Amino acid sequence: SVCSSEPENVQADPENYTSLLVTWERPRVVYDTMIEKFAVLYQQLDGEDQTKHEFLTDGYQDLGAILNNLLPNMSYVLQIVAICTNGLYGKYSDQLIMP
Amino acid sequence: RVFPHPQDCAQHLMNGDTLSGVYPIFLNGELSQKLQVYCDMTTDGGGWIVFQRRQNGQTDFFRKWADYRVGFGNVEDEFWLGLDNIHRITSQGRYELRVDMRDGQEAAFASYDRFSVEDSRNLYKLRIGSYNGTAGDSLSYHQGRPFSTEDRDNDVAVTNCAMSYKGAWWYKNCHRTNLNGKYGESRHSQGINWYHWKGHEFSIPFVEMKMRPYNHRLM
Ligand SMILES: [Ca+2]
């Protein structure tokens, strides 16, 4: 059902107290299609506003995204999923959780 | 000889040196600026300075800025002529670019009727003209972009294009051509790619990048 395996080695690496460098590796397997782009989905873990957001990358080769305006000392939970050219979606990365 | 100190391979050709091989050229015709180059004297009438060749993967192309600035390798085998040299040559007049590629018996090419590389202060930005060829126009993606290496990231991607795709190039985010990438590497976008000819999961086993003055078409 999935159009690719999960993006691998998702690293968070805080740049500072408010910016997150999200990087990943291309899915190892892509099924009968091509990857068009990636979505980074994230939401606060603590606090009371558990609304999830999403950032879309430009293109299929830039394996990263900088997430800014992250509240300092707040914990966030993130997932990355590939968007394939045939409209299917890949396997969601492992969930990952600011100084 | 009509040109005592030829400044390009086309002037060698006019002198009667119509055999491909190694020749000296003299930038702006001045003897103190001698450079050793390989001249392709057969493609489309000859007269091309070859500035890059891949053909067997025995030479490492995953090098740093200083290496790509000065040049490396053997001009009779696999090599990169050097960005400072390419800048100085393409500043002599209007040059054209030709990329010739082969996969065994199948061949293709791409040509651009303007070609220049800017100077170091401008990070050797690529300028190309109008396309003709059979390989498809994969290099126009890279128009106006600075050169990047694994140790000097000038791309506009969050990632380090040169590190991720095992090469050195005028990367944007990231590439449709990767001719200094990893020899024989089929992994997506990491190999020697010319996208519109063979896609991103095929590494081209032979490629040559070469340049000639536009005005050689008049002669
Ligand atoms: Ca970058």
Numbering used by the authors:
A (entry chain B): 309 to 405, 408 to 409
B (entry chain A): 1130 to 1348
What's in the article?
PNNs are a condensed form of neural extracellular matrix that include the glycosaminoglycan hyaluronan and extracellular matrix proteins such as aggrecan and tenascin-R (TNR). TNC and TNR share a common domain organization that includes an N-terminal cysteine-rich region responsible for the formation of disulfide-linked multimers, followed by 5-14 epidermal growth factor (EGF)-like domains, 8 to 9 FN repeats, and a C-terminal fibrinogen (Fg)-like domain. Overall, our findings provide novel structural insights in the interactions between RPTPζ and tenascin family members, prove that the formation of a RPTPζ–TNR complex is essential to the assembly of PNNs, and provide a blueprint to explore a potential role for a RPTPζ–TNC complex in neural function.
The complex structure was solved by molecular replacement using the crystal structures of the Fg domain of tachylectin 5A and the FN5 domain of TNC as search models, and the final model was refined to 1.8 Å (Rwork/Rfree = 0.174/0.210). There are four complexes in the asymmetric unit that adopt a similar arrangement and can be superimposed with RMSD values ranging from 0.413 Å to 0.728 Å. Averaging over of the four complex molecules in the unit cell, the RPTPζ/TNR interface buries 496 Å2 on TNR and 535 Å2 RPTPζ for a modest total surface area of 1031 Å2. However, the shape complementarity coefficient of 0.74 suggests a highly complementary interface between the two proteins. Broadly, the RPTPζ–TNR interface can be divided into a major contact site and a minor contact site, and the following description only details contacts common to all complexes in the unit cell. At the major contact site, R334, M342 in RPTPζ pack against H1317 in TNR, while Y368 stacks against R1305, H1317, and H1329. Specifically, the side chain amide group of Q369 forms a hydrogen bond with the hydroxyl group of S1318 and with the main chain nitrogen and oxygen atoms of H1304 and the amino group of C1303.
